[PDB]
Design a protein around this motif. Structure first.
Motif, PDB file in Angstrom:
ATOM      1  N   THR A 216       0.841  -1.223   0.000  1.00 52.18           N
ATOM      2  CA  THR A 216       0.000   0.000   0.000  1.00 52.18           C
ATOM      3  C   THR A 216       0.869   1.264   0.000  1.00 52.18           C
ATOM      4  O   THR A 216       0.357   2.281  -0.319  1.00 52.18           O
ATOM      5  N   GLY A 217       2.140   1.139   0.363  1.00 55.95           N
ATOM      6  CA  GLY A 217       3.049   2.280   0.484  1.00 55.95           C
ATOM      7  C   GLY A 217       3.181   2.653   1.952  1.00 55.95           C
ATOM      8  O   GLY A 217       3.625   3.688   2.196  1.00 55.95           O
ATOM      9  N   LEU A 218       2.705   1.803   2.859  1.00 57.57           N
ATOM     10  CA  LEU A 218       2.807   2.084   4.312  1.00 57.57           C
ATOM     11  C   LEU A 218       4.200   1.699   4.823  1.00 57.57           C
ATOM     12  O   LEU A 218       4.615   0.584   4.574  1.00 57.57           O
ATOM     13  N   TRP A 219       4.858   2.610   5.522  1.00 56.07           N
ATOM     14  CA  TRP A 219       6.217   2.406   6.084  1.00 56.07           C
ATOM     15  C   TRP A 219       6.216   2.466   7.625  1.00 56.07           C
ATOM     16  O   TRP A 219       5.478   3.237   8.205  1.00 56.07           O
ATOM     17  N   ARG A 220       7.046   1.643   8.237  1.00 56.70           N
ATOM     18  CA  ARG A 220       7.277   1.725   9.644  1.00 56.70           C
ATOM     19  C   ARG A 220       8.474   2.621   9.946  1.00 56.70           C
ATOM     20  O   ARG A 220       9.566   2.405   9.418  1.00 56.70           O
ATOM     21  N   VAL A 221       8.239   3.620  10.783  1.00 55.09           N
ATOM     22  CA  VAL A 221       9.287   4.540  11.259  1.00 55.09           C
ATOM     23  C   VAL A 221       9.378   4.353  12.767  1.00 55.09           C
ATOM     24  O   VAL A 221       8.399   4.610  13.487  1.00 55.09           O
ATOM     25  N   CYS A 222      10.476   3.817  13.230  1.00 51.40           N
ATOM     26  CA  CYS A 222      10.676   3.516  14.676  1.00 51.40           C
ATOM     27  C   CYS A 222      11.776   4.397  15.139  1.00 51.40           C
ATOM     28  O   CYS A 222      12.794   4.483  14.458  1.00 51.40           O
ATOM     29  N   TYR A 223      11.522   5.115  16.240  1.00 51.59           N
ATOM     30  CA  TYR A 223      12.445   6.124  16.736  1.00 51.59           C
ATOM     31  C   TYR A 223      12.360   6.297  18.273  1.00 51.59           C
ATOM     32  O   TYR A 223      11.506   5.687  18.927  1.00 51.59           O
ATOM     33  N   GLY A 224      13.259   7.109  18.820  1.00 51.41           N
ATOM     34  CA  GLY A 224      13.312   7.356  20.295  1.00 51.41           C
ATOM     35  C   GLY A 224      12.643   8.657  20.682  1.00 51.41           C
ATOM     36  O   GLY A 224      12.747   9.634  19.975  1.00 51.41           O
ATOM     37  N   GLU A 225      12.031   8.688  21.849  1.00 52.31           N
ATOM     38  CA  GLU A 225      11.417   9.886  22.359  1.00 52.31           C
ATOM     39  C   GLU A 225      11.677   9.971  23.868  1.00 52.31           C
ATOM     40  O   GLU A 225      11.976   8.997  24.474  1.00 52.31           O
ATOM     41  N   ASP A 226      11.564  11.158  24.434  1.00 52.48           N
ATOM     42  CA  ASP A 226      11.760  11.395  25.873  1.00 52.48           C
ATOM     43  C   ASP A 226      10.810  10.435  26.618  1.00 52.48           C
ATOM     44  O   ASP A 226       9.648  10.309  26.253  1.00 52.48           O
ATOM     45  N   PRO A 227      11.325   9.692  27.598  1.00 53.85           N
ATOM     46  CA  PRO A 227      10.474   8.752  28.303  1.00 53.85           C
ATOM     47  C   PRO A 227       9.508   9.449  29.286  1.00 53.85           C
ATOM     48  O   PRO A 227       8.596   8.798  29.769  1.00 53.85           O
ATOM     49  N   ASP A 228       9.677  10.743  29.550  1.00 54.83           N
ATOM     50  CA  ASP A 228       8.936  11.330  30.643  1.00 54.83           C
ATOM     51  C   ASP A 228       7.592  11.817  30.205  1.00 54.83           C
ATOM     52  O   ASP A 228       6.666  11.814  31.021  1.00 54.83           O
ATOM     53  N   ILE A 229       7.457  12.159  28.924  1.00 52.36           N
ATOM     54  CA  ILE A 229       6.260  12.809  28.449  1.00 52.36           C
ATOM     55  C   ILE A 229       5.043  11.900  28.180  1.00 52.36           C
ATOM     56  O   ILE A 229       5.147  10.679  28.021  1.00 52.36           O
ATOM     57  N   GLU A 231       1.699  10.406  26.039  1.00 52.19           N
ATOM     58  CA  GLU A 231       1.459  10.012  24.678  1.00 52.19           C
ATOM     59  C   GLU A 231       0.912  11.213  23.870  1.00 52.19           C
ATOM     60  O   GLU A 231       1.277  11.410  22.730  1.00 52.19           O
ATOM     61  N   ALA A 232       0.068  12.033  24.488  1.00 52.50           N
ATOM     62  CA  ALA A 232      -0.383  13.251  23.851  1.00 52.50           C
ATOM     63  C   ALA A 232       0.797  14.133  23.394  1.00 52.50           C
ATOM     64  O   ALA A 232       0.760  14.719  22.282  1.00 52.50           O
ATOM     65  N   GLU A 233       1.799  14.277  24.244  1.00 51.87           N
ATOM     66  CA  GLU A 233       2.938  15.139  23.927  1.00 51.87           C
ATOM     67  C   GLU A 233       3.844  14.479  22.850  1.00 51.87           C
ATOM     68  O   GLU A 233       4.378  15.154  22.005  1.00 51.87           O
ATOM     69  N   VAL A 234       3.967  13.162  22.877  1.00 59.25           N
ATOM     70  CA  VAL A 234       4.681  12.428  21.786  1.00 59.25           C
ATOM     71  C   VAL A 234       4.064  12.804  20.435  1.00 59.25           C
ATOM     72  O   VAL A 234       4.782  13.162  19.516  1.00 59.25           O
ATOM     73  N   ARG A 235       2.738  12.737  20.347  1.00 59.03           N
ATOM     74  CA  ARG A 235       2.006  13.054  19.120  1.00 59.03           C
ATOM     75  C   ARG A 235       2.213  14.490  18.698  1.00 59.03           C
ATOM     76  O   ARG A 235       2.422  14.809  17.521  1.00 59.03           O
ATOM     77  N   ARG A 236       2.115  15.387  19.653  1.00 57.96           N
ATOM     78  CA  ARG A 236       2.405  16.783  19.310  1.00 57.96           C
ATOM     79  C   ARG A 236       3.821  17.015  18.833  1.00 57.96           C
ATOM     80  O   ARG A 236       4.053  17.949  18.070  1.00 57.96           O
ATOM     81  N   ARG A 237       4.758  16.219  19.322  1.00 55.30           N
ATOM     82  CA  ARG A 237       6.175  16.371  18.908  1.00 55.30           C
ATOM     83  C   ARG A 237       6.515  15.787  17.517  1.00 55.30           C
ATOM     84  O   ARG A 237       7.546  16.147  16.929  1.00 55.30           O
ATOM     85  N   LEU A 238       5.678  14.879  17.037  1.00 58.20           N
ATOM     86  CA  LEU A 238       5.980  14.186  15.789  1.00 58.20           C
ATOM     87  C   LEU A 238       6.267  15.044  14.574  1.00 58.20           C
ATOM     88  O   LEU A 238       7.296  14.814  13.920  1.00 58.20           O
ATOM     89  N   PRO A 239       5.454  16.086  14.275  1.00 56.74           N
ATOM     90  CA  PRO A 239       5.723  16.850  13.085  1.00 56.74           C
ATOM     91  C   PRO A 239       7.148  17.436  13.033  1.00 56.74           C
ATOM     92  O   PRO A 239       7.788  17.458  11.948  1.00 56.74           O
ATOM     93  N   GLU A 240       7.625  17.949  14.155  1.00 63.84           N
ATOM     94  CA  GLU A 240       8.953  18.538  14.145  1.00 63.84           C
ATOM     95  C   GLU A 240      10.030  17.471  14.070  1.00 63.84           C
ATOM     96  O   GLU A 240      11.049  17.650  13.374  1.00 63.84           O
ATOM     97  N   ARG A 241       9.815  16.359  14.765  1.00 59.91           N
ATOM     98  CA  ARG A 241      10.739  15.213  14.642  1.00 59.91           C
ATOM     99  C   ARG A 241      10.817  14.733  13.179  1.00 59.91           C
ATOM    100  O   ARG A 241      11.899  14.404  12.656  1.00 59.91           O
ATOM    101  N   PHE A 242       9.679  14.646  12.506  1.00 59.12           N
ATOM    102  CA  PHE A 242       9.659  14.167  11.116  1.00 59.12           C
ATOM    103  C   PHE A 242      10.399  15.092  10.115  1.00 59.12           C
ATOM    104  O   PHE A 242      10.717  14.671   9.004  1.00 59.12           O
ATOM    105  N   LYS A 243      10.710  16.342  10.506  1.00 56.11           N
ATOM    106  CA  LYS A 243      11.551  17.200   9.722  1.00 56.11           C
ATOM    107  C   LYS A 243      12.917  16.632   9.583  1.00 56.11           C
ATOM    108  O   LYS A 243      13.577  16.945   8.613  1.00 56.11           O
ATOM    109  N   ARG A 244      13.299  15.742  10.504  1.00 56.98           N
ATOM    110  CA  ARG A 244      14.567  15.051  10.410  1.00 56.98           C
ATOM    111  C   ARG A 244      14.448  13.557  10.107  1.00 56.98           C
ATOM    112  O   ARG A 244      15.291  12.973   9.417  1.00 56.98           O
ATOM    113  N   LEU A 245      13.467  12.911  10.679  1.00 57.17           N
ATOM    114  CA  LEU A 245      13.343  11.470  10.460  1.00 57.17           C
ATOM    115  C   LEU A 245      12.882  11.092   9.018  1.00 57.17           C
ATOM    116  O   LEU A 245      13.113   9.970   8.568  1.00 57.17           O
ATOM    117  N   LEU A 246      12.189  11.975   8.327  1.00 56.96           N
ATOM    118  CA  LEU A 246      11.811  11.695   6.946  1.00 56.96           C
ATOM    119  C   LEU A 246      12.740  12.432   6.028  1.00 56.96           C
ATOM    120  O   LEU A 246      13.047  13.586   6.283  1.00 56.96           O
TER     121      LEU A 246
END
Length: 388
Positions: A216-229, A231-246
């Motif tokens: 389908t074109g679906l890719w798995r992207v597995c990465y590290g995030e701050d353990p303290d935050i 799940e809501a904050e992980v999601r909010r952080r994704l767009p800026e992280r993806f500026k580098r991970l993609l």
């Protein structure tokens, strides 16, 4: 109560289904109890492909899999460190490639083949609640959609990873917890931006595994995030992280996140893979570091050896020493090869000392340019086979 003169397989993942398939095809009666990071174990290197061909499954898997002729090591900026080309093994194996395919698709193929075997029954959403054994049988209390039930079998092959394993009194050693990982499934055309179908991104902060899941074109992207935050904050952080991970530093409008799940994993290895008439394989037996373990789960080849040993006992009179030999062989593969390799892969991946990184990158750069050295490295995966 219900007695199975044959094997009950616990877990309906590929490892359980495979064990059943090879048992089934040899005439052994099998009952599979199936019950439930979506999706997970996904890459098949050449020795595993060879096994899948012995199971009779490879043609059907290849119709659906993402063909992967190479994998890449990349810097955090996307630039290539080394590309490892499976075609350098073309004289050594009939399977000079990797195949990528999400686990649910793999399971579906295996289930198709099991449906042709009247001596195999798959019981959907049945869980083992209690397990005990005596000299003659393993007795289980189960629950399923019809409620509670009792079932006994001559042998149990346990393949599921959730804490059977921990009901029968086995010792697990080498238990280590992971850092916080984030698994995302993403629609983004990575290949248009130059990535291979499987990529290991080496960076002290924005390390990742980026691997295609299906057609389908679906890719798995597995990465590290701050353990303290949260799940809501992980999601909010994704767009800026993806500026580098993609690759290509995409804005949100260039990709679709289909799924996101932060998770942690334990590594572990059972001290022995059999306790009387209950035998462990795959995730019930062991788990490697999650980030360096791509293609090194050993599950398929565990299943093959386990079915072979059970067949020898059940059909060929063999002594249970074949089952001890299974345990020694498969546990050696994990301790001697799979675990240390996956551990070293992840260490390299996340190395934060700039001088050590430069040395590591010189090593990868060399391995990616000297095709004899590339070949030796890709041939190492044959150690998944053990001594069998």
């Amino acid at each position: 109560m219900e007695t199975i003169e044959g094997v009950v397989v616990v877990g309906g993942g590929p490892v359980g289904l495979l064990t059943a398939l090879k048992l089934g095809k040899a005439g052994v009666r099998v009952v599979v109890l199936e019950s439930e990071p979506s999706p997970r174990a996904v890459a098949y290197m050449p020795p595993t492909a060879a096994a899948l061909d012995r199971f009779g499954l490879l043609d059907d898997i290849r119709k659906r899999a993402v063909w992967c002729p190479d994998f890449a090591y990349r810097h955090g900026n996307g630039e290539l460190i080394a590309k490892m080309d499976w075609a350098v093994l073309a004289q050594d194996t009939d399977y000079p490639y990797m195949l990528l395919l999400a686990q649910n698709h793999v399971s579906n193929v295996i289930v198709e083949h099991l449906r042709k075997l009247p001596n195999v029954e798959i019981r959907w959403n049945h869980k083992v609640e209690e397990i005990d054994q005596d000299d003659d049988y393993v007795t289980m209390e189960t629950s399923g959609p019809a409620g509670k039930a009792s079932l006994r079998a001559k042998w149990v092959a346990a393949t599921d990873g959730a804490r059977v394993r921990g009901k029968i009194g086995l010792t697990f050693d080498g238990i280590t917890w992971s850092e916080r990982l984030v698994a995302t499934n993403v629609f983004y055309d990575f290949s248009l931006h130059g990535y291979s179908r499987a990529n290991f991104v080496h960076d002290p902060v924005d390390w990742a595994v980026v691997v295609q899941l299906d057609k389908t074109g679906l890719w798995r992207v597995c990465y590290g995030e701050d353990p303290d935050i949260s799940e809501a904050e992980v999601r909010r952080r994704l767009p800026e992280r993806f500026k580098r991970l993609l690759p290509g530093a995409p804005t949100p409008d260039q990709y679709r996140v289909d799924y996101l799940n932060p998770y942690r994993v334990h590594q572990r290895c059972a001290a022995e893979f059999r306790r009387g008439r209950v035998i462990l394989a795959g995730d019930a037996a062991h788990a490697t570091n999650p980030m360096g373990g791509l293609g090194l789960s050993g599950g398929v080849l565990d299943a093959e050896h386990l079915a072979e040993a059970l067949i020898a006992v059940i059909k060929e009179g063999a002594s249970t020493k074949v089952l001890d030999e299974y345990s020694v062989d498969r546990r050696k593969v994990f301790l001697e090869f799979t675990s240390p390799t996956a551990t070293a892969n992840f260490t390299w991946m996340k190395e934060s000392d700039p001088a050590q990184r430069a040395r590591d990158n010189a090593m990868f750069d060399h391995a990616g340019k000297d095709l004899k050295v590339m070949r030796e490295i890709l041939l190492d995966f044959e150690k998944l086979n053990g001594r069998r």
